[PDB]
């Protein structure tokens, strides 16, 4: 259990001089909170005669199979976990403020797109009084920013070296391969029948 | 894991749309209110807190309905014209938000809430209950 | 000196005797029911428990009414058919005497109670409320 | 600006650079104050080709706001009504909005 100071009040409102009184402001809030922890368990079975007279060790493989399955499932739950008996993730609870990019025209139609305007506008639109904040995005999503072109044909980032490679950690980026990577596999960023499937999660940024 | 949170802090209905209910606070030593609406409101909405005494016929049956005088704290700027307690649900409260309140000085044996006169239309849309804190026996 | 206990374990009505009411239990991690009869009963009354899910259209409104799966424990030896949360208020339960229970394994977003088939007429003289507990929201 | 015969008010980087250097130098040096959403708007300006006007190809434009003589304050009128919710072609940039101040 823990406390969460909700908001302060306001007391010192300007008033006249020639008056021997004051005005009682309104107080704030405290909002004591709590929280639990969930368990992770399971079982399996082996066969005495089969495991004994076997080609090689099967038991130790299962322990290694259990520790990793817990490892990946925890992180997967920690991100998108539904509240019921699972830690509430920050993806699905929709408590973070979430933006969305407006589509672009092509041949009279209108398809959803992700320009270089967005990622520069997104990372630089974050209250500078919250401190620094790293960003998170899938590798394929970063491969979409690198291979971006202008109208003429030149690259937008790193003009003329066949590779961008910007030393990610310097600029608040941390690649991870758990994110929904809006580019399905590595092909959803097109113009025709490869529309970007409006509504997918591109990247997040937070302290 | 949720504990059986009904063996302490037990709640009872206080205003189910169109009916008031006396809820015994004799044993229990502390209590508040929890206001929740079921729809949108139209105008402001007030309520009249009351209290009762054990009838002489049976010490476990409601008697008459007497009001509760509102005892003021420090930093009070207005007192009801009669000095009797009254709660007011402010306008623009969406029906997915609970409000909390309580009287600071218990008196009697049980409490009862009723809509103030001229404000019984919106009273239907409100839903009021009462929880407890202690046992003492 | 009675603390404001509306906040810090509020309460809401689940079965007002006339119609059921879904009570959101998402922002809270514990909860429990506090039964209360208003008159003299006739036969043993049972209540079915239901849990809901967020509607695909709006995540702040109830969807269907799914049935809570009953879960046994160490010394449960009389499980009902296939498992469904169904509490049974026994007979010989006079008024001004409250009983309380809860479900061990929470699931869904909120819970609703309704009288089982064959106990609706008796259920018209009982009240059921819930008191959530604390959590972060 | 005029887009498809529909006159809409806008704010181009050309106007900003024309506003800053229009100070009566005799007055001295003068800083400029503006909301954070404004500086986010200029940094994300694009020419007719696709390249950015500031910081060509570095994914972010952050100079030192002392040599540039600009001071940010997050509770100015914020020309973008709502957090980054105004500035597109149509249905954007309500007129008569304060953008930035500058003074000795």
């Amino acid at each position: 259990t823990y406390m969460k100071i909700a908001d302060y009040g306001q007391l010192g409102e300007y008033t006249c001089d020639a008056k021997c009184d004051a005005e009682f402001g309104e107080p704030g809030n405290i909002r004591h909170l709590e929280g639990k922890t969930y368990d992770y368990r399971g079982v399996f079975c082996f066969n005495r005669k089969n495991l004994q007279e076997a080609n090689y060790d099967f038991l130790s493989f299962m322990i290694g199979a259990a520790q990793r399955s817990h490892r990946i499932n925890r992180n997967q739950a920690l991100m998108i976990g539904k509240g019921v008996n699972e830690p509430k993730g920050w993806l699905t609870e929709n408590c973070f403020p979430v933006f969305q990019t407006l589509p672009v025209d092509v041949n009279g139609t209108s398809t959803p797109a992700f320009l270089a305007q967005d990622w520069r506008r997104f990372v630089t639109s974050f209250p500078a009084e919250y401190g620094e904040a790293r960003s998170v995005m899938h590798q394929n999503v970063f491969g979409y920013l690198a291979a971006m072109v202008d109208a003429n044909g030149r690259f937008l980032f790193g003009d003329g070296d066949l590779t961008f490679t910007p030393d990610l950690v310097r600029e608040r980026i941390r690649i991870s391969n758990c994110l929904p990577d809006p580019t399905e596999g590595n092909t959803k960023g097109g113009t025709g029948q490869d529309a970007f499937a409006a509504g997918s999660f591109v990247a997040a940024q937070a302290a | 894991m949720n504990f059986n949170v009904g063996v302490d802090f037990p709640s009872f209905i206080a205003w189910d749309g169109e009916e008031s209910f006396p809820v015994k606070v004799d044993g229990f030593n502390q209590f508040g209110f929890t206001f929740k609406t079921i729809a949108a409101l139209t105008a402001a909405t007030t309520f009249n807190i009351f209290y009762h005494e054990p009838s002489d016929a049976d010490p476990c049956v409601p008697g008459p309905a007497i009001r509760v005088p509102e005892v003021p704290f420090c930093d009070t700027v207005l007192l009801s014209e009669d000095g009797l307690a009254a709660v007011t649900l402010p306008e623009t409260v969406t029906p997915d938000s609970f409000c909390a309140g309580t009287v600071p000085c218990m008196n009697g044996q049980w409490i009862s809430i009723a809509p103030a006169t001229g404000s019984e239309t919106n009273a239907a849309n409100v839903q009021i209950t009462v929880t407890m804190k202690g046992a003492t026996r | 000196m009675n603390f404001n206990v509306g906040v810090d374990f509020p309460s809401f009505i689940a079965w007002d005797g006339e119609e059921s009411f879904p009570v959101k239990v998402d922002g809270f991690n514990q909860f429990g029911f506090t039964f209360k009869t208003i008159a003299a009963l006739t036969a043993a009354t049972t209540f079915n428990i239901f849990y809901h899910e967020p509607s695909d259209a709006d995540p702040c409104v109830p969807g269907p009414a799914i049935r809570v799966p009953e879960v046994p424990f160490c010394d449960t030896v009389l499980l009902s058919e296939d498992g469904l949360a169904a509490v049974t208020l026994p007979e010989t339960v006079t008024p001004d005497s409250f009983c309380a229970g809860t479900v061990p394994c929470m699931n869904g977003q909120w819970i609703s109670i309704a009288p089982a088939t064959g106990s609706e007429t008796n259920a018209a003289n009982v009240q059921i409320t819930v008191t959530m507990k604390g959590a972060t929201r | 600006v005029d887009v498809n015969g529909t006159s809409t008010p806008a704010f181009l980087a050309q106007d900003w650079r024309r506003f800053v250097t229009s100070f009566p130098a005799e007055y001295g040096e003068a800083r400029s104050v503006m909301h954070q959403n404004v500086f986010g708007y200029l940094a994300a300006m694009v020419d007719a080709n696709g390249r950015f006007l500031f910081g060509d190809g570095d994914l972010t434009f952050t100079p030192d706001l002392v040599r540039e003589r600009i001071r940010i304050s997050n509770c100015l009128p914020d020309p973008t009504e709502g957090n980054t919710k105004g500035g597109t072609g149509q249905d954007a940039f309500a007129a008569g909005s304060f953008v930035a101040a500058q003074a000795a």
Binding site: - | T76, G101 | - | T88
Partner: peptide, 28 residues
């Protein structure tokens, strides 16, 4: 005197359009 204390139960989902400057168009 009652001190009403009110909180909301569910938060409504939000969605903000991350509009950006349009491409440079000549004046004239």
């Amino acid at each position: 005197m009652v001190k009403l204390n009110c909180r909301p139960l569910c938060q409504a989902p939000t969605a903000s359009r991350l509009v950006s400057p349009p491409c440079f168009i000549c004046r004239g």
